[PDB]
Amino acid sequence: QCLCVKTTSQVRPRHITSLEVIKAGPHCPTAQLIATLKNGSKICLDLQAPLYKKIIKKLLES
Amino acid sequence: QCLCVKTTSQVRPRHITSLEVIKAGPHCPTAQLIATLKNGSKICLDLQAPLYKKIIKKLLES
Amino acid sequence: DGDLQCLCVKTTSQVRPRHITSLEVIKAGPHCPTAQLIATLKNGSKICLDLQAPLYKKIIKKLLES
Amino acid sequence: GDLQCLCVKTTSQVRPRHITSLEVIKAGPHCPTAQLIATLKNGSKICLDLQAPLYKKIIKKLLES
Secondary structure (H helix, E strand, C coil): CCCCCCCCCCCCHHHEEEEEEECCCCCCCCCEEEEEECCCCEEECCCCCCCHHHHHHHHHCC | CCCCCCCECCCCHHHEEEEEEECCCCCCCCCEEEEEECCCCEEEECCCHHHHHHHHHHHCCC | CCCECCCECCECCCCCCCCEEEEEEECCCCCCCCCEEEEEECCCCEEECCCCCCHHHHHHHHHHCC | CCECCCECCCCCCCCHHHEEEEEEECCCCCCCCCEEEEEECCCCEEEECCCHHHHHHHHHHHHCC
């Protein structure tokens, strides 16, 4: 019953306010990357992708 | 899209630390009840009144 | 101790339940002696709601009825 | 602003294995600085320093599963 077990990512690094990295375990066998956007909505970044990278950095150089 | 498309009701209310209620938007047809547990986990809740009700009251009556 | 502290510092009563696009309910604990009601808005701003006010009951309904 | 920074203080050290969740919050009107919030297995949450070689060592232990 993963939180992030569906589509993954096509977002604008512009509107991400926070990025949460959740470890795999009980309810989810894989690591989930959830992203909170300005408008308050959430999304799942791709554990298996590059984009989530610059995203973190960006958030840290703010 | 959403993160919540496989909601659950198997959760123990004393183990919830916070509950996020996301308003239905374009990319997601329905409202979402994100529950974060004591161990940091996240799960999607069934949009059934008695549940989140009994929950928001245990969260707000700490 | 506690590296965390309450996110909320003051609550907004005069809020337009319309623009509220999300709501987070936080249980009390080490981080904060009281529970917290943080509502984000369509514009991206965030405000805290009063626990001794029905408004949140209202807002949560409006948010869950789609 | 109704909000302030959650991280009123930080911890320079703890074991990455204990971390179940790591939340990265970018600076804004709520807080003049970015924040690194880690949740541990026991349930506690700590704030970390923004010094790359540590959280990257944590972010890895988190995704290697």
